[PDB]
Amino acid sequence: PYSLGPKISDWDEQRRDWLKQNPSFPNFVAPNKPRVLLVTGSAPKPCENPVGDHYLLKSIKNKIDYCRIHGIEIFYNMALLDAEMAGFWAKLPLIRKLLLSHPEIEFLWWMDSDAMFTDMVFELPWERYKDYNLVMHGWNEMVYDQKNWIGLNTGSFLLRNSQWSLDLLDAWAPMGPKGKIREEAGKVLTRELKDRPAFEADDQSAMVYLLATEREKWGGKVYLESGYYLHGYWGILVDRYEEMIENHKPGFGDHRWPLVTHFVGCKPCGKFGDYPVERCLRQMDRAFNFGDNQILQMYGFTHKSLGSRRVKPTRNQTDRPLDAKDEFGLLHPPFKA
Amino acid sequence: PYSLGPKISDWDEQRRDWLKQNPSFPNFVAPNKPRVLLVTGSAPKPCENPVGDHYLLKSIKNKIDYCRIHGIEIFYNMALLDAEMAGFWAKLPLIRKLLLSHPEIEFLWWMDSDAMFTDMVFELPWERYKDYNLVMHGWNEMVYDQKNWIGLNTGSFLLRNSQWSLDLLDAWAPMGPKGKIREEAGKVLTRELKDRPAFEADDQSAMVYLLATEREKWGGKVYLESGYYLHGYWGILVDRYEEMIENHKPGFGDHRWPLVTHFVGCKPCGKFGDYPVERCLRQMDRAFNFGDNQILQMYGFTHKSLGSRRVKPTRNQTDRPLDAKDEFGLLHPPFKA
Numbered sequence: 001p002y003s004l005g006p007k008i009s010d011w012d013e014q015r016r017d018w019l020k021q022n023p024s025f026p027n028f029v030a031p032n033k034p035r036v037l038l039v040t041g042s043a044p045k046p047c048e049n050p051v052g053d054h055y056l057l058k059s060i061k062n063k064i065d066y067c068r069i070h071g072i073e074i075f076y077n078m079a080l081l082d083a084e085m086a087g088f089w090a091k092l093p094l095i096r097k098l099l100l101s102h103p104e105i106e107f108l109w110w111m112d113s114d115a116m117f118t119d120m121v122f123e124l125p126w127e128r129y130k131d132y133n134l135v136m137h138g139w140n141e142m143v144y145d146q147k148n149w150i151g152l153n154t155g156s157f158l159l160r161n162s163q164w165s166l167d168l169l170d171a172w173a174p175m176g177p178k179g180k181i182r183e184e185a186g187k188v189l190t191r192e193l194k195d196r197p198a199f200e201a202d203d204q205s206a207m208v209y210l211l212a213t214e215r216e217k218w219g220g221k222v223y224l225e226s227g228y229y230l231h232g233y234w235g236i237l238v239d240r241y242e243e244m245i246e247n248h249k250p251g252f253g254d255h256r257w258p259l260v261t262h263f264v265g266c267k268p269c270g271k272f273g274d275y276p277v278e279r280c281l282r283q284m285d286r287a288f289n290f291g292d293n294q295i296l297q298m299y300g301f302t303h304k305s306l307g308s309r310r311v312k313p314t315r316n317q318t319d320r321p322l323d324a325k326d327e328f329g330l331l332h333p334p335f336k337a
Numbered sequence: 338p339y340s341l342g343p344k345i346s347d348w349d350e351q352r353r354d355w356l357k358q359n360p361s362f363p364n365f366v367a368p369n370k371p372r373v374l375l376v377t378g379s380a381p382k383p384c385e386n387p388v389g390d391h392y393l394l395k396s397i398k399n400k401i402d403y404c405r406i407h408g409i410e411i412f413y414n415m416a417l418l419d420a421e422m423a424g425f426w427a428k429l430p431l432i433r434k435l436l437l438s439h440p441e442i443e444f445l446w447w448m449d450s451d452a453m454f455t456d457m458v459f460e461l462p463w464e465r466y467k468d469y470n471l472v473m474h475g476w477n478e479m480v481y482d483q484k485n486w487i488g489l490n491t492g493s494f495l496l497r498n499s500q501w502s503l504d505l506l507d508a509w510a511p512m513g514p515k516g517k518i519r520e521e522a523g524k525v526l527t528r529e530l531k532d533r534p535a536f537e538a539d540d541q542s543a544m545v546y547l548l549a550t551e552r553e554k555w556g557g558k559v560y561l562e563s564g565y566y567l568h569g570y571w572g573i574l575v576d577r578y579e580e581m582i583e584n585h586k587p588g589f590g591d592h593r594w595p596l597v598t599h600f601v602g603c604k605p606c607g608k609f610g611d612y613p614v615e616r617c618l619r620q621m622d623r624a625f626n627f628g629d630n631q632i633l634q635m636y637g638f639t640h641k642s643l644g645s646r647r648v649k650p651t652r653n654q655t656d657r658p659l660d661a662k663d664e665f666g667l668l669h670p671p672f673k674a
């Protein structure tokens with residue numbers, strides 16, 4: 001019987017003591033700003049197609065920029081800590097290890113390598129979640145009623161460092177172990193979830209299954225967010241970037257300017273994805289430039305077009321650089337208090 | 338005639354004024370701990386050699402881990418801001434833009450992409466540099482006396498945000514502009530420096546030629562460091578890694594445990610390196626694992642060997658994870674208090 005590790009039950013107490021003992025590492029870096037660690041990663045071998053690694057590189061640059069602006073630290077995992085939890089299931093052993101290793105962390109923000117920040121201004125509404133322990137993009141009707149396997153997304157979610165989350169992880173992991181366990185579990189999810197195709201169990205479908213069946217246990221602390229694109233399906237967003245630049249501005253986080261553009265199904269690191277490789281990579285270039293344009297604007301540059309690697313100036317240089325207007329206040333945002 | 342931008346002569350005063358008006362953004366984040374921006378980058382296009390991008394990815398994960406531990410921010414540039422200053426010369430326009438855009442930065446730490454942190458414990462001796470503006474690995478006699486084009490290294494150096502540094506940049510760039518200017522300046526360097534081969538002007542040789550021919554003007558603010566491997570030629574280190582693990586411990590930063598292993602001559606991304614690609618990449622794997630071991634060991638894991646991607650546990654799991662602190666106190670170091 002698979003276990004994520006020795007059962008822990010007094011974690012809230014262990015954390016409470018530690019924080020009291022170690023006031024130099026508070027779990028809140030500011031009145032209403034919890035300490036957040038963004039966690040991402042990739043397999044420890046080169047991508048099967050070679051440009052895959054190049055797009056992992058642009059992906060981590062993109063997260064570096066956002067996290068530098070909004071004052072959150074990054075952990076990039078390149079190791080499998082549990083041979084049975086491979087692939088998308090590898091993030092459960094990782095998350096548990098980081099939560100227990102870093103009690104100063106109040107929120108752990110997992111973000112897939114195929115997910116990219118496209119709104120560099122938007123700051124998560126932390127106070128909205130002060131009473132919750134798990135925040136994922138999704139809809140309650142899709143999860144609890146329709147039991148739709150895409151009722152929520154697990155490529156970009158917040159998990160609070162708490163006893164509730166250690167138990168949540170234990171409840172979530174059973175369908176993960178590679179082999180017969182994951183395969184037979186995939187048959188269950190395909191049968192019990194709406195619109196799910198037939199394939200081995202994935203971490204996302206299992207979360208829908210867990211929350212739909214055991215809602216009384218977990219639902220009270222889960223927040224299914226759909227007011228902004230904590231996760232954003234690329235297939236309906238990337239084509240509208242131009243409309244967004246023309247009618248809106250960064251900071252909305254939603255349909256007007258998505259916080260995250262998540263390239264589900266493109267699999268730039270594998271041999272084949274569920275979509276044309278041409279459209280996947282060109283749209284990943286457009287998404288990367290859509291965000292990078294917000295970085296370069298601070299420094300007086302922009303990409304010639306949304307699909308070009310080349311940049312151009314947006315203004316003449318000056319001998320009075322400190323007089324310049326930072327349009328969105330990202331050079332010295334309040335997130336770096 | 339080429340210029341890095343409009344002439345600024347009052348930057349030290351502009352900065353002081355800005356800092357007085359923006360106390361929430363100090364240039365010292367703690368007593369004798371300056372605010373540091375580590376800067377790196379790579380060409381915006383995939384690597385000629387395809388697997389080269391996988392090592393750019395490993396290289397930036399390495400820098401993320403060190404900068405997270407030691408409380409240093411990262412900027413990863415992928416844009417060519419100045420068509421004339423292509424190649425290794427591209428860092429001069431970038432460094433100027435960043436210094437001018439971030440007056441809160443006391444020290445900018447440039448780092449080649451093929452340079453990797455192999456001592457995750459070593460913190461730079463900042464006080465040693467309180468009266469200097471440019472810190473590079475090198476030797477006084479080789480640079481000033483012998484005029485040796487390898488008397489210093491410009492792949493890992495600190496540059497203080499100051500009018501002095503802006504002026505140095507003005508003096509350093511002239512041999513840069515691609516074309517007849519760089520190629521002709523290259524023939525001048527080959528003829529005035531010791532043991533320089535024949536190739537286009539390069540920023541390292543140009544820095545030697547400047548400091549040797551204009552010592553009185555520049556030398557008093559340059560610290561040529563050789564007490565630790567701020568830059569560490571891979572050729573004389575990578576074969577000694579297992580010896581270091583047996584005899585020494587992270588924190589020395591020098592011949593016993595180098596801070597930086599820099600793979601000069603390898604060109605894992607480009608082509609036509611001074612060494613065989615296979616030898617280069619395997620040793621970069623070893624360097625990466627050598628550093629990554631220090632990260633994984635905070636969490637109870639290590640690489641089975643410096644040549645294996647697999648990791649193994651260093652200790653059994655526990656239900657009391659806050660009792661045993663890590664061997665080098667890197668989970669909660671003073672750099673993040």
Ligand SMILES: O=c1ccn([C@@H]2O[C@H](COP(=O)(O)OP(=O)(O)O)[C@@H](O)[C@H]2O)c(=O)[nH]1
Binds near residue numbers: 042086090155265
């Ligand atoms: O061996 C692995 C496989 C995946 N991931 C991470 O888990 C996420 C989700 O895994 P998935 O198999 O769904 O790939 P995706 O289609 O989301 O890119 C990936 O994006 C990676 O960021 C990882 O860290 N190690």
Ligand SMILES: O=c1ccn([C@@H]2O[C@H](COP(=O)(O)OP(=O)(O)O)[C@@H](O)[C@H]2O)c(=O)[nH]1
Binds near residue numbers: 378380492
């Ligand atoms: O187009 C470029 C080329 C290089 N660099 C950076 O400048 C350093 C030195 O460039 P070089 O041509 O010497 O390549 P190297 O042999 O050092 O890897 C690289 O490592 C990169 O970090 C960059 O930012 N943009």
Ligand SMILES: [Mn+2]
Binds near residue numbers: 112114155264
């Ligand atoms: Mn994904």
Ligand SMILES: [Mn+2]
Binds near residue numbers: 452599
């Ligand atoms: Mn180099």
